[PDB]
Design an enzyme around this catalytic site. Structure first.
Site, PDB file in Angstrom:
ATOM      1  N   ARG A 156       0.828  -1.197   0.000  1.00  0.00           N
ATOM      2  CA  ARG A 156       0.000   0.000   0.000  1.00  0.00           C
ATOM      3  C   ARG A 156       0.869   1.257   0.000  1.00  0.00           C
ATOM      4  O   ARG A 156       0.592   2.231  -0.712  1.00  0.00           O
ATOM      5  CB  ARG A 156      -0.905   0.003   1.233  1.00  0.00           C
ATOM      6  CG  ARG A 156      -1.769  -1.240   1.379  1.00  0.00           C
ATOM      7  CD  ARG A 156      -2.486  -1.253   2.728  1.00  0.00           C
ATOM      8  NE  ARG A 156      -3.406  -2.381   2.858  1.00  0.00           N
ATOM      9  CZ  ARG A 156      -4.724  -2.304   2.688  1.00  0.00           C
ATOM     10  NH1 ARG A 156      -5.296  -1.146   2.384  1.00  0.00           N
ATOM     11  NH2 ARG A 156      -5.472  -3.391   2.827  1.00  0.00           N
ATOM     12  N   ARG A 205      11.582  -8.996  -1.727  1.00  0.00           N
ATOM     13  CA  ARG A 205      12.558 -10.033  -1.990  1.00  0.00           C
ATOM     14  C   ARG A 205      13.024 -10.737  -0.729  1.00  0.00           C
ATOM     15  O   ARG A 205      13.225 -11.956  -0.744  1.00  0.00           O
ATOM     16  CB  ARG A 205      13.713  -9.520  -2.841  1.00  0.00           C
ATOM     17  CG  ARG A 205      13.472  -9.754  -4.332  1.00  0.00           C
ATOM     18  CD  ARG A 205      14.251 -10.951  -4.821  1.00  0.00           C
ATOM     19  NE  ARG A 205      15.644 -10.823  -4.396  1.00  0.00           N
ATOM     20  CZ  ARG A 205      16.514 -11.825  -4.331  1.00  0.00           C
ATOM     21  NH1 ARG A 205      16.142 -13.060  -4.663  1.00  0.00           N
ATOM     22  NH2 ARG A 205      17.758 -11.592  -3.924  1.00  0.00           N
ATOM     23  N   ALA A 206      13.165  -9.982   0.358  1.00  0.00           N
ATOM     24  CA  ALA A 206      13.485 -10.577   1.656  1.00  0.00           C
ATOM     25  C   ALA A 206      12.495 -11.698   1.983  1.00  0.00           C
ATOM     26  O   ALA A 206      12.879 -12.793   2.411  1.00  0.00           O
ATOM     27  CB  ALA A 206      13.440  -9.523   2.747  1.00  0.00           C
ATOM     28  N   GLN A 207      11.221 -11.403   1.752  1.00  0.00           N
ATOM     29  CA  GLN A 207      10.120 -12.302   2.074  1.00  0.00           C
ATOM     30  C   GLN A 207      10.186 -13.588   1.258  1.00  0.00           C
ATOM     31  O   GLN A 207      10.085 -14.699   1.803  1.00  0.00           O
ATOM     32  CB  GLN A 207       8.808 -11.573   1.812  1.00  0.00           C
ATOM     33  CG  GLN A 207       7.573 -12.349   2.129  1.00  0.00           C
ATOM     34  CD  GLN A 207       6.997 -12.999   0.900  1.00  0.00           C
ATOM     35  OE1 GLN A 207       7.003 -14.231   0.763  1.00  0.00           O
ATOM     36  NE2 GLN A 207       6.478 -12.177  -0.005  1.00  0.00           N
ATOM     37  N   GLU A 246      11.472 -19.247   0.670  1.00  0.00           N
ATOM     38  CA  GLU A 246      12.178 -20.265  -0.078  1.00  0.00           C
ATOM     39  C   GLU A 246      12.931 -21.200   0.875  1.00  0.00           C
ATOM     40  O   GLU A 246      13.001 -22.401   0.660  1.00  0.00           O
ATOM     41  CB  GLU A 246      13.234 -19.547  -0.889  1.00  0.00           C
ATOM     42  CG  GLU A 246      13.204 -19.711  -2.376  1.00  0.00           C
ATOM     43  CD  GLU A 246      14.421 -19.048  -2.995  1.00  0.00           C
ATOM     44  OE1 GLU A 246      15.559 -19.456  -2.639  1.00  0.00           O
ATOM     45  OE2 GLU A 246      14.242 -18.100  -3.801  1.00  0.00           O
ATOM     46  N   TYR A 247      13.533 -20.633   1.914  1.00  0.00           N
ATOM     47  CA  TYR A 247      14.450 -21.388   2.752  1.00  0.00           C
ATOM     48  C   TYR A 247      13.725 -22.050   3.903  1.00  0.00           C
ATOM     49  O   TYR A 247      14.268 -22.908   4.605  1.00  0.00           O
ATOM     50  CB  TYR A 247      15.553 -20.482   3.288  1.00  0.00           C
ATOM     51  CG  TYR A 247      16.744 -20.459   2.377  1.00  0.00           C
ATOM     52  CD1 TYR A 247      16.836 -19.528   1.341  1.00  0.00           C
ATOM     53  CD2 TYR A 247      17.780 -21.377   2.533  1.00  0.00           C
ATOM     54  CE1 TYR A 247      17.933 -19.506   0.497  1.00  0.00           C
ATOM     55  CE2 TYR A 247      18.885 -21.367   1.685  1.00  0.00           C
ATOM     56  CZ  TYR A 247      18.952 -20.432   0.671  1.00  0.00           C
ATOM     57  OH  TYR A 247      20.042 -20.409  -0.166  1.00  0.00           O
ATOM     58  N   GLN A 251      14.884  -7.301   8.277  1.00  0.00           N
ATOM     59  CA  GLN A 251      14.847  -5.932   8.751  1.00  0.00           C
ATOM     60  C   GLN A 251      15.989  -5.103   8.176  1.00  0.00           C
ATOM     61  O   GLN A 251      15.809  -3.918   7.830  1.00  0.00           O
ATOM     62  CB  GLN A 251      14.815  -5.906  10.275  1.00  0.00           C
ATOM     63  CG  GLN A 251      13.403  -6.126  10.797  1.00  0.00           C
ATOM     64  CD  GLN A 251      13.352  -6.286  12.293  1.00  0.00           C
ATOM     65  OE1 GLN A 251      14.390  -6.347  12.957  1.00  0.00           O
ATOM     66  NE2 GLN A 251      12.142  -6.360  12.839  1.00  0.00           N
ATOM     67  N   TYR A 294      17.415  -5.859   5.237  1.00  0.00           N
ATOM     68  CA  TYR A 294      17.089  -5.781   3.815  1.00  0.00           C
ATOM     69  C   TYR A 294      16.171  -4.605   3.502  1.00  0.00           C
ATOM     70  O   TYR A 294      16.417  -3.859   2.557  1.00  0.00           O
ATOM     71  CB  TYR A 294      16.434  -7.087   3.357  1.00  0.00           C
ATOM     72  CG  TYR A 294      16.647  -7.433   1.900  1.00  0.00           C
ATOM     73  CD1 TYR A 294      16.910  -6.447   0.956  1.00  0.00           C
ATOM     74  CD2 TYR A 294      16.590  -8.749   1.468  1.00  0.00           C
ATOM     75  CE1 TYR A 294      17.105  -6.767  -0.379  1.00  0.00           C
ATOM     76  CE2 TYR A 294      16.784  -9.079   0.135  1.00  0.00           C
ATOM     77  CZ  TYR A 294      17.042  -8.082  -0.783  1.00  0.00           C
ATOM     78  OH  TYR A 294      17.238  -8.403  -2.105  1.00  0.00           O
ATOM     79  N   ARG A 321      21.414  -6.410   4.958  1.00  0.00           N
ATOM     80  CA  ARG A 321      20.792  -7.718   4.999  1.00  0.00           C
ATOM     81  C   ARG A 321      21.836  -8.826   5.227  1.00  0.00           C
ATOM     82  O   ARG A 321      21.502  -9.924   5.689  1.00  0.00           O
ATOM     83  CB  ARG A 321      20.045  -7.972   3.688  1.00  0.00           C
ATOM     84  CG  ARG A 321      20.705  -9.040   2.841  1.00  0.00           C
ATOM     85  CD  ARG A 321      20.333  -8.980   1.381  1.00  0.00           C
ATOM     86  NE  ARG A 321      21.444  -9.505   0.589  1.00  0.00           N
ATOM     87  CZ  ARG A 321      21.440  -9.628  -0.733  1.00  0.00           C
ATOM     88  NH1 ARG A 321      20.368  -9.268  -1.428  1.00  0.00           N
ATOM     89  NH2 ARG A 321      22.505 -10.121  -1.358  1.00  0.00           N
TER      90      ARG A 321
END
Ligand SMILES: CCCCCCCCCCCCCCCC(=O)O
Ligand SMILES: CCCCCCCCCCCCCCCC(=O)O
Ligand SMILES: CCCCCCCCCCCCCCCC(=O)O
Ligand SMILES: CCCCCCCCCCCCCCCC(=O)O
Ligand SMILES: CCCCCCCCCCCCCCCC(=O)O
Ligand SMILES: CCCCCCCCCCCCCCCC(=O)O
Ligand SMILES: CCCCCCCCCCCCCCCC(=O)O
Ligand SMILES: CCCCCCCCCCCCCCCC(=O)O
Ligand SMILES: CCCCCCCCCCCCCCCC(=O)O
Lengths: 147, 147, 147
Positions: free
Chosen positions: B33, B53-55, B60-61, B97, B99, B106
């Site tokens: 938003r 991208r952090a998310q 992924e990991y 945080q 990132y 990061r």
């Protein structure tokens, strides 16, 4: 000594989840040709993008769903956990189908999916509390005792 | 006959992981938003992209983390596995945080997350070796015997 | 009372899967520098994009693979489930390597990965049927009886 019986529902919902997820993957690979977005491009018309994203989102939440399903199911109640599991999966099926048509038509089943999921988390949390809280309260009441 | 006790820590860290992950998802949907990147667009200012991208990376990991957590925890040692599990999750919280603020901020928590994770893998590997190596060495020492 | 023995293969394949997956992640982060696609950008030359996407696809299918591996392995047969598990992982290794070179060279190992995976699903489904079908047929044959 057998342990399959206390777990078969959890495993069956898990399998539903696997199938549901595969379905999404296949719905994506069918929209792919039909747009005619070619790999490895994942951008195209705003409709293919909507479908691609539904799949990604589900596939992101799917391990959280599995994790809690097993924790709620083992520490709280198998049939209750299995139950939210179904509502959740169902909600995510409606979610994927709304999204494909409209970004706005994705939200009611998302809201439904979020409820079912947060329920699973609470049950998991409560089941862990039961397990952990007494033993720790018991030992708390040892420091202050001492007479 | 009960098996909950040998597993409750693994399940509790798993649940931490689920919560941490949900948090990221919510931090993403709040940056969404605020940028004002609209779905299904996942590209925007270089800051929203950093958060998105952090998310993704964590998400992924996250199954690798769960997989090894359970294998290390069952075949090596529950409390040790649970322990890296926490460092890892913690490192991934710092990761998300850093990132969000900076791509460079990061890396320290990523490096920390990578250590904790690789530790889990070794323990899992060592626990599987213990289980598997004797029975196989025992039987190796049968071919050459024969007298 | 020990339950490690009936599960050690499933856990070992799971660990193979974790390693395979980590490998992909590392192959991605090596192509990253070499293109010279910088984070958080995940778009670049058509070759880096091919590699990035292989990784994503595997990482999407990896929990489905784990889920069914454990369900087939517990409800049908450990060594059989472990067996497809290996073919699957192997197929996904060929998949990632084909893809990196060519989008067309990804397909044979994808087709192989899809077979191994669908096998796992059937076994899981059949194992759940065995578990669930008799008890339910038994009780079906109670309604119509009544004499
Ligand atoms: C409380 C009962 C829950 C029933 C879940 C059964 C799921 C079957 C679908 C596969
Ligand atoms: C021995 C102490 C164990 C500490 C774990 C706390 C888990 C409770 C969280 C719900
Ligand atoms: C065995 C249980 C030990 C007692 C725990 C103390 C009571 C707190 C939980 C209500
Ligand atoms: C060694 C002990 C490890 C403790 C892990 C407890 C995690 C509790 C957080 C939920
Ligand atoms: C019976 C032989 C089992 C072979 C599996 C090998 C697992 C060891 C790998 C760590
Ligand atoms: C029961 C154990 C069988 C003996 C295995 C041979 C010794 C190799 C492991 C040290
Ligand atoms: C049927 C036997 C299956 C063997 C799987 C062993 C995997 C070892 C690799 C880690
Ligand atoms: C008690 C009834 C349980 C219903 C679950 C059905 C699972 C079978 C699906 C394979
Ligand atoms: C204990 C088994 C109960 C009988 C189930 C009825 C037979 C159907 C399955 C063939």
């Amino acid at each position: 000594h057998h342990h399959k019986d206390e777990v078969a529902l959890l495993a069956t919902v898990t399998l539903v989840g696997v199938l549901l997820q595969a379905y999404f993957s296949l719905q994506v690979i069918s929209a792919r040709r039909a747009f005619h977005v070619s790999p490895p491009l994942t951008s195209g018309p705003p409709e293919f993008e909507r479908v691609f994203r539904a799949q990604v989102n589900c596939s992101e939440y799917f391990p959280l769903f599995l994790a809690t399903l097993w924790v709620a199911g083992i520490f709280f109640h198998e049939g209750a956990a299995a139950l939210c599991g179904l509502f959740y999966l169902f909600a995510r099926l409606r979610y994927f189908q709304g999204y494909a048509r409209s970004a706005q038509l994705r939200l009611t089943p998302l809201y439904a999916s979020a409820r079912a999921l947060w329920l699973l988390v609470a049950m998991a949390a409560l089941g862990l509390l039961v397990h952990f809280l007494p033993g720790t309260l018991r030992t708390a009441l040892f420091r202050w005792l001492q007479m």
